[PDB]
Amino acid sequence: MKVPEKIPMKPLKGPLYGGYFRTWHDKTSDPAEKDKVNSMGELPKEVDLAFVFHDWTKDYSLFWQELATKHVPTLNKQGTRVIRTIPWRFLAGGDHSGIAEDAQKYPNTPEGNKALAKAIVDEYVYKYNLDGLDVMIERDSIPKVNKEESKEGIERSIQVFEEIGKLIGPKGADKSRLFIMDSTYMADKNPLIERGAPYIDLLLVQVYGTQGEKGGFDNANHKAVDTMEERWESYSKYIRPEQYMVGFSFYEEKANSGNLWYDVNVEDDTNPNIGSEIKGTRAERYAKWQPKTGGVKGGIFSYGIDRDGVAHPKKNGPKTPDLDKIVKSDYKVSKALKKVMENDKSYELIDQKDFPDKALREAVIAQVGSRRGNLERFNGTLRLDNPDIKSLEGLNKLKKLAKLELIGLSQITKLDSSVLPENIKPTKDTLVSVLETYKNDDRKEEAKAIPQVALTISGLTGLKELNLAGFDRDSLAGIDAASLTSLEKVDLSSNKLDLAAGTENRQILDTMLATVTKHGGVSEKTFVFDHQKPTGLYPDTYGTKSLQLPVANDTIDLQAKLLFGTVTNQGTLINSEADYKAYQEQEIAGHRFVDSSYDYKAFAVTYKDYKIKVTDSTLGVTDHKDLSTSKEETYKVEFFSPINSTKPVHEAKIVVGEEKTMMVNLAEGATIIGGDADPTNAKKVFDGLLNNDTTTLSTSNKASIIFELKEPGLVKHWRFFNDSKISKADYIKEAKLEAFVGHLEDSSKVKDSLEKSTEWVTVSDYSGEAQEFSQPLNNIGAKYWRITIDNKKSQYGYVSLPELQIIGHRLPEAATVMTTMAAAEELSQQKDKFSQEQLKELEVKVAALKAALDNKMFNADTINASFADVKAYIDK
Numbered sequence: 047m048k049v050p051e052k053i054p055m056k057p058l059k060g061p062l063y064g065g066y067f068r069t070w071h072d073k074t075s076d077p078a079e080k081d082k083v084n085s086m087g088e089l090p091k092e093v094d095l096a097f098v099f100h101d102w103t104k105d106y107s108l109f110w111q112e113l114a115t116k117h118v119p120t121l122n123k124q125g126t127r128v129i130r131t132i133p134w135r136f137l138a139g140g141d142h143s144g145i146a147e148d149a150q151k152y153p154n155t156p157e158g159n160k161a162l163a164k165a166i167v168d169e170y171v172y173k174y175n176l177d178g179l180d181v182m183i184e185r186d187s188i189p190k191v192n193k194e195e196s197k198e199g200i201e202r203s204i205q206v207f208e209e210i211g212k213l214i215g216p217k218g219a220d221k222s223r224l225f226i227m228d229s230t231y232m233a234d235k236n237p238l239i240e241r242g243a244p245y246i247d248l249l250l251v252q253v254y255g256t257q258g259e260k261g262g263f264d265n266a267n268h269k270a271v272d273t274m275e276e277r278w279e280s281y282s283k284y285i286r287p288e289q290y291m292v293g294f295s296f297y298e299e300k301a302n303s304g305n306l307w308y309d310v311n312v313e314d315d316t317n318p319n320i321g322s323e324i325k326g327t328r329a330e331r332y333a334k335w336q337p338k339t340g341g342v343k344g345g346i347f348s349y350g351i352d353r354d355g356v357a358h359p360k361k362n363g364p365k366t367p368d369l370d371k372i373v374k375s376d377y378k379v380s381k382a383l384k385k386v387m388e389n390d391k392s393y394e395l396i397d398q399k400d401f402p403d404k405a406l407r408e409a410v411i412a413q414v415g416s417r418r419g420n421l422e423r424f425n426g427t428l429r430l431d432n433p434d435i436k437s438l439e440g441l442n443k444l445k446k447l448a449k450l451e452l453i454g455l456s457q458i459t460k461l462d463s464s465v466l467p468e469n470i471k472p473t474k475d476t477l478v479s480v481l482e483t484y485k486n487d488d489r490k491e492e493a494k495a496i497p498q499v500a501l502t503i504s505g506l507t508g509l510k511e512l513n514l515a516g517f518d519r520d521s522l523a524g525i526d527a528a529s530l531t532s533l534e535k536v537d538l539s540s541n542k543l544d545l546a547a548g549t550e551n552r553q554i555l556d557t558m559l560a561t562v563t564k565h566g567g568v569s570e571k572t573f574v575f576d577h578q579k580p581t582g583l584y585p586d587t588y589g590t591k592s593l594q595l596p597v598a599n600d601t602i603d604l605q606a607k608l609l610f611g612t613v614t615n616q617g618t619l620i621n622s623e624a625d626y627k628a629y630q631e632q633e634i635a636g637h638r639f640v641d642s643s644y645d646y647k648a649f650a651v652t653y654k655d656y657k658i659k660v661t662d663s664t665l666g667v668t669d670h671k672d673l674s675t676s677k678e679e680t681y682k683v684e685f686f687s688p689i690n691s692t693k694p695v696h697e698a699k700i701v702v703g704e705e706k707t708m709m710v711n712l713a714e715g716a717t718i719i720g721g722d723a724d725p726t727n728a729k730k731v732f733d734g735l736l737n738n739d740t741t742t743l744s745t746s747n748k749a750s751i752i753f754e755l756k757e758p759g760l761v762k763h764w765r766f767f768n769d770s771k772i773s774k775a776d777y778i779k780e781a782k783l784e785a786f787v788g789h790l791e792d793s794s795k796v797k798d799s800l801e802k803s804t805e806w807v808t809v810s811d812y813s814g815e816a817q818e819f820s821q822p823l824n825n826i827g828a829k830y831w832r833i834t835i836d837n838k839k840s841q842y843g844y845v846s847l848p849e850l851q852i853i854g855h856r857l858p859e860a861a862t863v864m865t866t867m868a869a870a871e872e873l874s875q876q877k878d879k880f881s882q883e884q885l886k887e888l889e890v891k892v893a894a895l896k897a898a899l900d901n902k903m904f905n906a907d908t909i910n911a912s913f914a915d916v917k918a919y920i921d922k
């Protein structure tokens with residue numbers, strides 16, 4: 047075969063139209079299927095990108111001959127590129143994987159994956175001298191081995207995608223070939239976008255049908271999901287708006303259910319040509335659709351463009367077999383859709399009418415884009431640092447800039463609303479979507495507020511008038527006042543500027559004031575800054591983090607003591623009405639700045655929906671705000687804002703009397719060893735949750751758990767809960783806690799008497815009817831524990847246990863420490879010892895380690911000394 051070399055073509059320019067031509071509908075594919083009447087070569091010049099979509103189970107060798115020798119030169123001559131489409135699979139190997147089926151020639155190794163990428167471009171692109179490669183990423187093309195989805199193959203396809211990107215596309219060795227990704231997936235579900243995005247020229251999203259357009263529907267919340275705007279935002283992380291193309295489908299002959307998109311007009315006997323009309327179709331809506339932010343899109347594309355013009359069978363009308371007949375298309379829908387995008391307001395060029403100043407127009411064109419649609423949508427930074435700019439006229443046409451930077455424009459004498467972006471001040475979005483919506487969501491659809499542009503000004507050494515009044519600006523940050531050596535008039539009134547002394551706002555304001563009073567008259571009209579209503583925020587950090595107070599019969603309000611205050615965005619703490627009136631009447635050069643109307647309740651934060659979590663040294667927790675002092679105890683107070691009850695906003699330790707050490711729950715995450723409780727819910731007793739949503743049921747009516755603390759320590763307390771939501775009648779009514787002393791009967795170690803047959807020691811024996819029970823315990827160092835519970839109902843009692851706590855202090859191998867202090871007085875129980883002249887010392891210690899172990903303060907240093915001291919007598 048004699049493949050012609052590539053003829054010259056102009057660069058692709060938006061708006062772009064794409065079409066997927068199914069190869070089995072080319073005349074030349076099967077000269078025996080005389081019903082196949084179309085030809086790829088007949089596509090019109092309105093088609094920028096013609097994808098070859100093939101049935102990989104056929105040869106069609108005569109078609110590839112016609113493709114390479116007639117159709118590609120014909121299409122290239124009109125500016126149309128011919129793109130080879132391949133399934134995702136082809137980059138992975140495995141089932142039906144094309145070239146990659148030869149795993150022995152292309153092994154899954156670093157060198158083999160580089161060889162496979164090169165073979166892929168050689169075979170699917172360069173063989174017929176095509177213009178690029180389109181990898182279709184969707185459920186129907188996913189890597190599979192023996193019909194099952196291959197996570198390994200997916201991992202491999204990422205490696206091979208990169209390697210192809212080194213050969214073609216914007217980062218490839220051959221930048222004349224496009225590298226395209228088309229996908230049905232949202233970006234977070236696309237396994238290849240994160241690594242592949244830098245390598246592709248274009249990203250195509252297949253959004254056929256009403257579910258592509260409106261999103262799917264979340265029936266639990268009655269809200270759309272995966273909407274067209276959400277899909278674009280998910281990929282906006284990875285590609286530029288002009289790289290994004292959205293796809294609809296024509297009607298494929300004999301389409302089954304699940305292949306019925308209705309993207310073109312439904313048939314009508316009384317207008318046999320309505321299939322070729324586009325007005326109001328989903329395809330026309332995609333031609334018209336534009337994201338609300340970023341920029342204008344790259345274009346749209348059709349699936350099954352050989353069916354261009356066939357009308358769509360009715361959803362629930364009779365069989366219409368005429369539509370399933372194959373006919374020669376005139377490509378009329380495609381030509382019209384292309385004209386719709388070409389003539390659309392968004393794609394009009396930015397020109398002198400938008401920006402008169404030639405040098406400004408060229409900085410906007412370079413950073414924002416060439417299209418007027420982008421003025422409406424671009425939401426990044428605009429840097430203006432060419433001093434040759436003589437007029438900032440036009441910048442008002444920028445609607446959603448994140449940041450404006452005016453740097454060293456020595457020729458700009460004025461700044462005000464006429465030469466500033468529209469969102470210098472608070473504004474809402476005015477674009478209106480062309481898409482259908484789910485009326486099954488009769489909820490919002492409301493014009494989202496646009497964030498205000500950040501304003502940076504420096505080196506405007508000819509700026510004479512700055513007027514920013516009435517804009518609700520939140521700060522002056524970004525104004526390098528010390529370069530505005532030519533200021534004569536400044537107005538900053540009616541904003542949200544905290545100008546109180548000590549703030550950086552004040553410094554910028556004061557430096558400007560220095561510039562203007564060194565100039566002429568500083569009249570009541572020359573430097574105005576009043577009527578500021580700055581925003582009251584929550585203090586990031588609070589004042590009191592610890593309070594020692596005496597044991598008294600007083601109920602203290604912890605929230606009034608520890609949590610109050612409001613803070614401006616510059617750090618001005620206001621705790622009170624009194625504080626705020628002092629603030630209201632602050633002054634600059636004999637003039638107040640805070641607005642006279644600005645009430646304290648207007649400005650001031652509130653703590654209505656805030657939550658408190660008070661925890662004592664024995665781990666008892668309450669959410670009571672008023673705390674009593676009547677009891678020698680040490681607490682941990684925490685406050686939680688309504689928006690988040692997992693991380694606290696402020697915490698503080700409250701000591702009543704002499705401080706006790708904070709104990710921990712040593713049973714947290716304990717391992718279930720044995721007993722008759724259900725193992726899954728037995729685990730949940732120790733995971734740490736007081737009212738587990740999940741079922742806490744241990745058995746039907748009496749249960750036991752043998753368990754093992756992760757890190758054994760010194761136990762001083764225990765606690766267990768019944769779950770509220772249940773009646774007292776179903777509460778645990780008798781409990782028995784036992785510790786395993788006399789370690790490991792018959793031992794066996796790895797072989798394990800699940801301790802089911804030994805002499806354990808009963809540490810507690812509960813008999814009551816309360817929701818929560820807690821009790822002090824006498825210094826046990828056991829690692830193995832058993833609890834038995836009984837709610838005293840019938841055999842079908844379904845006894846339940848949300849949480850059990852074994853509470854004390856972390857002491858590594860405290861059992862040996864206990865075994866000694868116990869054996870110490872039993873080697874004073876052998877008592878056949880003389881040592882009376884000796885042992886003033888042997889006693890001044892088992893009553894000093896004893897006295898240090900029982901001290902509310904837990905000093906790990908003391909006890910580890912005193913214990914190692916007494917076993918100096920293993921030497922008698």
Ligand SMILES: [Ca+2]
Binds near residue numbers: 732736738848
């Ligand atoms: Ca629990």
